[PDB]
Amino acid sequence: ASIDRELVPWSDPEFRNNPYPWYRRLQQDHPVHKLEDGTYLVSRYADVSHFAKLPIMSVEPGWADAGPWAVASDTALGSDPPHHTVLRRQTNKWFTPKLVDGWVRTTRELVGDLLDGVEAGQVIEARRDLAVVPTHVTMARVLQLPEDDADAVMEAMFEAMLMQSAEPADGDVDRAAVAFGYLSARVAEMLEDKRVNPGDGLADSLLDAARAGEITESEAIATILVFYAVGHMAIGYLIASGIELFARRPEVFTAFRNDESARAAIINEMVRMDPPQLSFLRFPTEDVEIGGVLIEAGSPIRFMIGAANRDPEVFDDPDVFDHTRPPAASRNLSFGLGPHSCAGQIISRAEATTVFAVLAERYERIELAEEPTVAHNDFARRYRKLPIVLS
Numbered sequence: 001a002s003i004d005r006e007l008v009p010w011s012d013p014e015f016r017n018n019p020y021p022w023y024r025r026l027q028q029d030h031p032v033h034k035l036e037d038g039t040y041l042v043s044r045y046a047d048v049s050h051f052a053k054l055p056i057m058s059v060e061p062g063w064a065d066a067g068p069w070a071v072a073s074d075t076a077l078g079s080d081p082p083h084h085t086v087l088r089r090q091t092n093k094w095f096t097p098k099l100v101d102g103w104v105r106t107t108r109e110l111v112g113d114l115l116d117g118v119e120a121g122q123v124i125e126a127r128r129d130l131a132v133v134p135t136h137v138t139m140a141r142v143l144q145l146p147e148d149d150a151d152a153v154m155e156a157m158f159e160a161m162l163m164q165s166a167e168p169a170d171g172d173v174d175r176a177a178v179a180f181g182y183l184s185a186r187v188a189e190m191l192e193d194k195r196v197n198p199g200d201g202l203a204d205s206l207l208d209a210a211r212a213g214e215i216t217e218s219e220a221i222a223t224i225l226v227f228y229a230v231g232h233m234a235i236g237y238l239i240a241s242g243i244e245l246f247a248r249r250p251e252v253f254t255a256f257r258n259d260e261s262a263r264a265a266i267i268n269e270m271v272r273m274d275p276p277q278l279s280f281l282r283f284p285t286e287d288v289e290i291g292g293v294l295i296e297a298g299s300p301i302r303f304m305i306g307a308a309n310r311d312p313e314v315f316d317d318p319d320v321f322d323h324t325r326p327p328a329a330s331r332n333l334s335f336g337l338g339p340h341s342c343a344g345q346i347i348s349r350a351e352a353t354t355v356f357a358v359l360a361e362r363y364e365r366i367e368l369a370e371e372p373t374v375a376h377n378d379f380a381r382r383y384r385k386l387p388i389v390l391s
């Protein structure tokens, strides 16, 4: 209780900015820690790896209770197998590598356009203009939905994410209700337009799957809304994080420039050191013993991704950025694992590669024009602004 505040002060500004020193104590001394409220924190790589992916780990109860976020219950994120596999089939077939090569053409075009527009030495707000809008429009093009709402989409997800903290402030649930009301209204308008003017994008595919009985109508519309809303979000964070990293560690940007074959490794090390999603929940459908601690069926288990990605039992010098870590020790948990591993992962890596590549094509050096403005919490990392100058 006061023990919980010492290990994981979820609301503390310092913990929120950089929890990683606290994660060490957790992982070393309290690897399976039961909080006050009943949630077990699981922070060792081995335990996250082995346990989070088990068939007994249900994703159902938390999202079903999540108020405004219950929309996730009608997607892969909040649905267990067997139906999980069928929801995932609906979108996986849209995001094979060859399909993704074509989708990220949009990413490349928009980045090139932005960069063509600038004057030498001009301050670029990299979070909106190189991260959020390119990825938002990329996904909207795949869906075949209108492309022009990135800014209000991003504000809405900013508001919807507040209640995902382990310690929501008063009113954060209400703010999420407002956010999801907006996204629902926008999706409803866009789908009425699509009934009268159908396309052949991922949104038309999902609607057809619901008409064909493969998924429900609610599941089609919830999947549309989620992919449309989050297309910019965690991927927008990874892009901005990598840009900041290129700026504070220019030898990394130079390596990315000089060595095409290192690119996937560099992006994967960025992803390891700064996951945008710091945990997820699971609800075991039967008792399970982890680290010698018996967790009862139904108890919340919060698997700590960020903490696990610095496990020194797996990663030597875990707080050191090193893109040369060997294949035997370069697997991180930032995209999850098991059947729920991120449904955006192949397009995410390709979008981040595209933006960094365009930058690499045109410049030698990234600098921060001022300190970045961030809005992190215990659950998700987030930039508000990332002013840069390219040379």
Ligand code: HEM
Pocket (backbone or CB within 6 Å): 059, 075, 076, 077, 078, 088, 226, 227, 230, 231, 232, 233, 234, 235, 236, 238, 275, 276, 277, 280, 281, 305, 333, 334, 335, 336, 337, 339, 340, 341, 342, 343, 344, 345, 347, 348
């Ligand atoms: C850097 C980018 C991203 C990271 C680091 C990330 C992280 C994650 C994590 C940690 C999970 C597992 C959640 C859990 O198991 O409860 C997840 C799942 C998911 N993500 Fe991503 N995410 C990213 C980008 C995206 C994008 C662009 C999309 C839009 C397609 C997306 C859509 C999803 C969906 C639908 C799931 C649920 C998959 C399932 O339950 O089978 N993500 N993501």
